[PDB]
Amino acid sequence: KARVYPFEDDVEVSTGDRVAPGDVLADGGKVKSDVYGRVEVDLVRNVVRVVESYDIDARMGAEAIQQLLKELDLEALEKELLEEMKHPSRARRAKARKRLEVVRAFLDSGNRPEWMILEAVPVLPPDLRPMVQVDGGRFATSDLNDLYRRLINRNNRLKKLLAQGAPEIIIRNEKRMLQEAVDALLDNGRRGAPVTNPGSDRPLRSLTDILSGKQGRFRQNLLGK
Amino acid sequence: EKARDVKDTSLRVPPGEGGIVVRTVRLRRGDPGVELKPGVREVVRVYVA
Amino acid sequence: ITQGLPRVIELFEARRPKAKAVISEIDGVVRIEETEEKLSVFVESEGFSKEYKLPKEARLLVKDGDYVEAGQPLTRGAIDPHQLLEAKGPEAVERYLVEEIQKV
Amino acid sequence: DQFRVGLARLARGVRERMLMGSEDSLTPAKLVNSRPLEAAIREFFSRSQ
Amino acid sequence: SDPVRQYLHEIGQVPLLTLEEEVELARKVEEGMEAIKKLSEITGLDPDLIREVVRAKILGSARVRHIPGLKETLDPKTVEEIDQKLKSLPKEHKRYLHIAREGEAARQHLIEANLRLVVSIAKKYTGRGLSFLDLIQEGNQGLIRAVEKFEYKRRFKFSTYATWWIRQAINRAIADQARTIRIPVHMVETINKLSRTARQLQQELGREPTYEEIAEAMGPGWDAKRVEETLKIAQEPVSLETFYGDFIPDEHLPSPVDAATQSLLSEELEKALSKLSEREAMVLKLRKGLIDGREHTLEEVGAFFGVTRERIRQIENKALRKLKYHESRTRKLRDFLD
Amino acid sequence: KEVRKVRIALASPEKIRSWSYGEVEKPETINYRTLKPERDGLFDERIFGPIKDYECACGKYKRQRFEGKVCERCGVEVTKSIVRRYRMGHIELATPAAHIWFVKDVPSKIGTLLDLSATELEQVLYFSKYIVLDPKGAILNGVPVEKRQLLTDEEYRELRYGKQETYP
Amino acid sequence: QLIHKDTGLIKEDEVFLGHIPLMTEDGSFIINGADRVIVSQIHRSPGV
Amino acid sequence: GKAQFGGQRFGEMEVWALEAYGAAHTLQEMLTLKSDDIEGRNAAYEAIIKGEDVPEPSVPESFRVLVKELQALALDVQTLDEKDNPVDIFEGLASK
DNA sequence: GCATCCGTGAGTCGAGGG
DNA sequence: TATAATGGGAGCTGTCACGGATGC
RNA sequence: CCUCGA
Ligand SMILES: [Mg+2]
Ligand SMILES: [Zn+2]
């Protein structure tokens, strides 16, 4: 589904370029674009082909969600939900209250919603995830190091895949693996099958596990010692 | 007095235990029939009745 | 009906009991309406009317033509503390919880 | 049962070896790695409930 | 839900290449790289910067980042300036720009069309320390290398040449990422050769081999001691949460007894130094490095007190002598020598 | 000063980077021979702190006279080793990632703020569907694309790169 | 025995699969020098 | 554990006992000077061998561990004073 | 309004054996 | 560095009570 | 994890 535009002279757009109706294609401005689309310059057929396509910004993942969260103007949304709170329907007032509670929490706290997405992942001090020589001279180490190493390998492979101009599918796969790495680091098992070390069915112990439960930090070392 | 190169890591009787020594086993690297986990030179087991 | 630790836990957690009594939302007089195959109890005020449809084998605490308080039990069983709170108010529920726990 | 599981792993490795490697020269010994079966028996006897 | 199922579906979207489509895309890639070299010849620009600008415009403004090797930061302004310098050339010099653009697009579609082969090869390397998807992505890296290096004129299929690089990348990833304590490639290869040797020896002996048997089977240069040290270096750590770490004391932080013992040692050394003159106590403290943390030379302490190094050495000697006398007398500092 | 309150709040990427003493660029722990920490790895003394009291990694400064001084040769601060319990590091992400607490704790705070359902937020975050930020006047099935629309993969391909087919 | 369907070639060998722990006279085992017991398990029988 | 020359666990319920008795100092002692307040426990042992009364406890080390693990969760946990101005339980050793 | 799937809890202290 | 090779594989499930989203 | 003790 495309539109052909033959050219007799030097062309002003190359392959891949995105273009709108009424743009300069070839012959010094003579033959122009009718339709919205993307340009294939056929040098064999000597025709500038324009395949119908838009310049849509449609993204995936935490990058997209972070943008949509940066965009949010809180006070406006608060006003909208207040206008919603006057609705006769009880369920609409219920949903508006549930949302407005979050909105006003962010408002009064001075927190930015976008911070619920991570750019710089923190890293725990090493002594809290030790690498120690046990009695017999062998080595023993916390699970957090294996989770962090997973994260760093995937992050670095992503950086290199980007620098080397990888196709879309490959970058999508790498970004998905990266999200799941951060997932398993922060709260392993929460989404998807829990990450395990090789040759064992034992879930690695993430930060959430360190904090909560009867064996967690609070009940095991803070409310009792 | 010069500080010695090595220090005392000997195996002592834990608090609240003791008795009569009735057996000693000694395994050494480089000795017949004896191969230990990598890095250990020798193993010594003392039995206390 | 429940005894022991399950009843105490049921009370301290403010759970709606499995076999729960049915209580009157308002005052009024009791008019019993029993078909051979179906049963209902009506609390009739001077200007208002409340209809409670309950399974036929439920035991009534209630004679025909008696004056029942708001939140008074009609059927036997445990009382839903939240229905009691909505009907009769806080002091009543404080009373009910303390006494029901102490029974055990 | 644990023997059966270790054998299943040994057979997965056997097929994985049958796809790789020289198709003309293969013995039973070149095909079979016993280690997973050993592991299954070792875990059943050391760490089973 | 399940990420490998998702990836296999996304891969099953792009259809497989026929001989003609494959050869065409590979040809376009070759001629586009040649066109980039020609654009470097004409423009005097950097071939890598030209390649990055052509690539940038092909993919979109969605991805333009800083490439490590480039001397210039790659941002939409510089790529616009460079693309306008590349659009301002004569028709026969503007031909190579279109060739390069087509080459980039062909390269993209070639990788995407061959992504199933990486899965079919990586499925064989599971259980080696890396997740299925990690093996897949490292194989995709190798596939990218193979696309950039492939030569269609040799008439070989692309699967043949790509398999070599895909295996190379998967194996490099295993050898570089599997161990929590990282080990160099050659050392990993030596360890795996050791393992195969030991396994063959146990298969023929009906028992696990000794260090000496492995060394003999390993050839010259290998003795029992070297087999032992190699296995010792290849030992991998174990989990603290097996918990297993709750039996592990802290040798680093000084115990309360040790802290109090050093406290009483400092206090008793000062008690003993007080029985000297302030100058000889100060000479000892400077020579032992107590005052500023380090020990001064005799010339520094002597210039500090304004005296000859022989004199300050004699003052230190007599101070040490009076200390030895007081200590032999009161026997106070004896216990602290262990 | 005496502790009176304890506050807890979300941490901004800038705040996180302010905690950090260095970025962990390599998934390396310690060296297989020296057993010492690797450069730019998870245990590096250049970031987290000295392993021995008042002694840099290479040994050029071994005493408390140097306090706060950063050795120029090995890049290790001369200070107490206790700091390896305290100093944070960080990892800089090629692409941002969602903190799963604010995703999977129902009802999702992120999903509540953006009026996105659990399913939709999952589909965007784990790369099953596109969310549109600007339609640039796109059209799907005759309806113009509205912002925050949920596009499948076929839809996004048909709109962004056009429709086509090949027949044998 | 290894059998190629096409070649018809047949190569057979006695391969060593490792060791199986032996039960002692009294019904116990010795695993890594320590005597151990395998406890019977009760469970729901297969069936309909 | 007896083999590790271990200490007895003073769990949540023992804490409840001490709270019920109102023995604030006994309990604070259990929580700081006797377990994981490092400066506190060293100073206490030295005080007792010197015949001195025990020094006032300070922050238990596992609370600092909790704070650092919450920072690892990308949550900022601030000890404040009554003027709502931060207090440094790490004594500057974790700030650049 | 009422069924249904998901997540999260379910005593302590010991000892040993690992 | 070149024969060609193109979508995984493990999978037993005897609790229960709570809030909350999801549907009819 | 298990078994054991209160
Ligand atoms: Mg030899
Ligand atoms: Zn140094």
Swiss-Prot record, chain D:
It comes from the Bacteria. The RNAP catalytic core consists of 2 alpha, 1 beta, 1 beta' and 1 omega subunit. When a sigma factor is associated with the core the holoenzyme is formed, which can initiate transcription. Belongs to the RNA polymerase beta chain family. DNA-dependent RNA polymerase catalyzes the transcription of DNA into RNA using the four ribonucleoside triphosphates as substrates. This is DNA-directed RNA polymerase subunit beta. It comes from Thermus thermophilus (strain ATCC 27634 / DSM 579 / HB8). The gene is rpoB.
UniProtKB/Swiss-Prot annotation, chain F:
Zn(2+) 1 binds at residues 56, 58, 71, 74. It comes from the Bacteria. DNA-dependent RNA polymerase catalyzes the transcription of DNA into RNA using the four ribonucleoside triphosphates as substrates. Belongs to the RNA polymerase beta' chain family. The RNAP catalytic core consists of 2 alpha, 1 beta, 1 beta' and 1 omega subunit. When a sigma factor is associated with the core the holoenzyme is formed, which can initiate transcription. This is DNA-directed RNA polymerase subunit beta'. It comes from Thermus thermophilus (strain ATCC 27634 / DSM 579 / HB8). The gene is rpoC.
